[PDB]
Subunit: 258 residues, 4 copies
């Protein structure tokens, strides 16, 4: 079965989700042509440990060797920071998880590096709209299948496709727990939602076809046709009559609660 | 089916809605202990016909004998103006409808008469909160059961009950048209909302049990237990992204559109 | 404000269910030691045809020979009225269905004949409590499996067993239609309930073991172990927020609706 | 205002009254288990038209379809003759009205079918005693309330009740005229009686509670509790010295006149 959180559990989860949003607000100033992805990893690690008094959750998790994930261009997810510099025309995803006194918060966003193609800015805008529509249907008595149907309809109207081989997850005292959150599907299918459940919504959307391929290093996933791919993520709580977003930033204009 | 209004129809419904709101702003200055409900009906009739250049919709409609409805304490709806004085401690509903060049606007509010008891004040507060929550869920793709469920949950968790045999309604070039609007129910059920539809939200909430009965005159309804009952009403348009309230007053702080 | 409206088919099903409940209210005054089950059939038939201006649905249905069903002691369901008298200590089920201008109403209850023993009284009481728990979970968005789970848990923690090979049914302008309503199972399984659906809740519960067998007339079912069995039945409507009982009597204290 | 009959109208009322009593004397030998109420209707019709040279007043009167009324067990009044046989143990009322050259006579009695239970025999006897006590108070100077008080007191001492919704009537050249004759009330109330008035006394008495219910055919009335009901009827003239009974049978022992 899925876990139900207490009123005291809910207060410690609000503190961890605010600190994860603050790392994304700090890192923006440092993104330009010429800076390396291993330079960005060192800056985020020192801020989390020395200034917030917390720990980066990816470090040593099932053998992962760094503190954050960094994914550029045709890469879908799980990219490893290294010594290559950022170039004029690149699109970039930064993905963060923090632990504070045993509790987890999980979130990601897109950056545009100088002059980009018009196709590329539009792919990134339509991906963010898809995540906001999926959050809008969450409440007691809805089903998990209602999330997948609304995301899949908005992507296909714009000529793009939905990745099937990766998904969202429950979260709390551990990094990954039940249920599996699919980003495609039919309304009315899957488990019924209840007050006190906590889970992520994290859609991956491709320019061409849906299939992926894994690289040599055992971690890095790319598109099979070599076209572009975009992602955004938030942590979400089910309340008495709707939703609350735990990881909301100062620069966003969508409302925190229903 | 359900009628869909044109751009010219909408402009004329905005003029009728503003006039009905001004009748309520005007009469609040005349209400205090000692005044009769028949004197209040005379003041409202003269304002509508001689200053606005319009007509009162209740007058002679299926035999009804007056131009407004006035309901006190244990009365639920449809009270007839008469020769009795208002008293220190009473609670009062005034319900208005105006016709201007063929088009209808409909709205009602609660007034406190001199010094009132704390348990009467709490009932009037919770009922106005119920109405505003039902308005906040309206947009294209929502369903009518969404309105019923959010109203019923807010009343019952605070210890109050919902009136079952009276409802809200469609409105335009006629007073009463399709659909029926219930104040109780389950989310995602009933017909689906579209741009250009117009209807009323008007909940009746009780201090004690939900049952009602009709008196000897054929018109006045009361609570079967003789405890208190309260009501508030607005006229509402579905827009391209949300709602617009056509009967909003300058004394209110809640926003006009989404 | 304006008064709510009600579709014509629902007004006609409310009339048929009030008539079937009135048949059970009338017949209780005639039940006592020495009266035969064929004499109860003749009294019921005359009331429905001459006073109500209606018809008995069991008569001639797939060949059945009488107007009502009468089921005694170790008999489980579908017994035929005959020339044998009732005796002191007996338990009795009387099962009724009425048709009024094409529309159907379906209901049954238990009667205690003279002084009865303590172990018979306890079985009849727990069977009534099972039926009422099953009606309590009905609303838009519940599943057919939630009805079977709550009935099966209440019977088994009190020491009794559930009959598996007979079920409740859909009803309206016809006697028997989809869905099948099982009295055992697991919560969240089977079809979802919707506003406007109409069906029966009718559990059979046994003193000992659950297995049954059919006698040679092709109709009468009995317990395999020869110990006692009991049943109660109502017709139920799904409303916009919960349930309505169409066949309620003036003698019951459970509420007609959710509201209450 | 009540009509007063002349000496010539009085001699013609005596002839019609003796004929209606002769119908009741004839029919008694045909009543036993297994005969139908429509067979009894045919025998009465033929005797009145072919042997008396007269007409049955109920036939086609305001829609009524038969020549006599036949009421059994829990039925109170107005039963329609039909194809159902009489059963051993029943109680039965036969009600007759004849017209002879324009003048009306009206009377009824109770019959026991085969062997009967002893406390049904008792209800039929106490009902006959009630009728005879009301005839006994009639003379010039009495009041109509004296009739109702004496009837009600006898029935309630014996544990029975009086039907309120049906009553006795004026009679003459028309079937139903003024005054209304109630079978409950207080001594010394209502109109004062005068020589030359003619009216009926016809009490209905129940085993349990007094309330009644109407069947679907629109004519047949029953007890609300389903217990037994009985009735007896005579036509009565006010004379100079006291009373005269116009419908007396050859088998009765009560005195014809004062
Ligand atoms: Mn995640
Ligand atoms: Mn993540
Ligand atoms: Mn479901
Ligand atoms: Mn990418
Ligand atoms: Mn009130
Ligand atoms: Mn109104
Ligand atoms: Mn929909
Ligand atoms: Mn209205
Ligand atoms: Mn049945
Ligand atoms: Mn059945
Ligand atoms: Mn049995
Ligand atoms: Mn008569
Ligand atoms: Mn008469
Ligand atoms: Mn009778």
């Amino acid at each position: 079965t899925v876990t139900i959180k207490t009123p005291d559990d809910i207060e410690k989860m609000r503190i961890a989700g605010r600190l994860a949003a603050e790392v994304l607000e700090m890192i923006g100033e440092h993104i330009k042509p010429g800076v390396t992805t291993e330079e960005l990893d060192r800056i985020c690690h020192d801020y989390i440990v020395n200034e917030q008094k917390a720990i980066p959750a990816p470090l040593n998790y099932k053998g992962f060797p760094k503190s954050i994930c960094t994914s550029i261009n045709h890469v879908v997810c799980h990219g490893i920071p290294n010594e290559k510099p950022l170039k004029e025309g690149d699109i970039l995803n930064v993905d963060i998880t923090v632990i504070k006194d045993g509790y987890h918060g999980d979130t990601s966003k897109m950056f545009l590096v100088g002059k980009t193609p018009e196709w590329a800015d539009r792919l990134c805008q339509i991906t963010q709209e898809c995540m906001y529509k999926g959050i809008s249907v969450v409440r007691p008595g809805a089903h998990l299948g209602d999330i997948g149907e609304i995301i899949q309809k908005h992507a296909e109207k714009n000529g793009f496709s939905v990745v099937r081989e990766y998904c969202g997850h429950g979260i709390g005292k551990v990094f990954h727990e039940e249920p599996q959150v699919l980003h495609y599907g039919r309304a009315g299918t899957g488990i019924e939602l209840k007050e006190g459940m906590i889970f992520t919504i994290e859609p991956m959307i491709n320019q061409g076809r849906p299939e992926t391929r894994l690289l040599g290093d055992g971690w890095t996933a790319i598109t099979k046709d070599r076209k572009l791919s975009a992602q955004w993520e938030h942590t979400v709580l089910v309340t008495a009559d709707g939703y609350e977003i735990l990881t909301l930033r100062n620069d966003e204009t969508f409302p925190r609660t229903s």
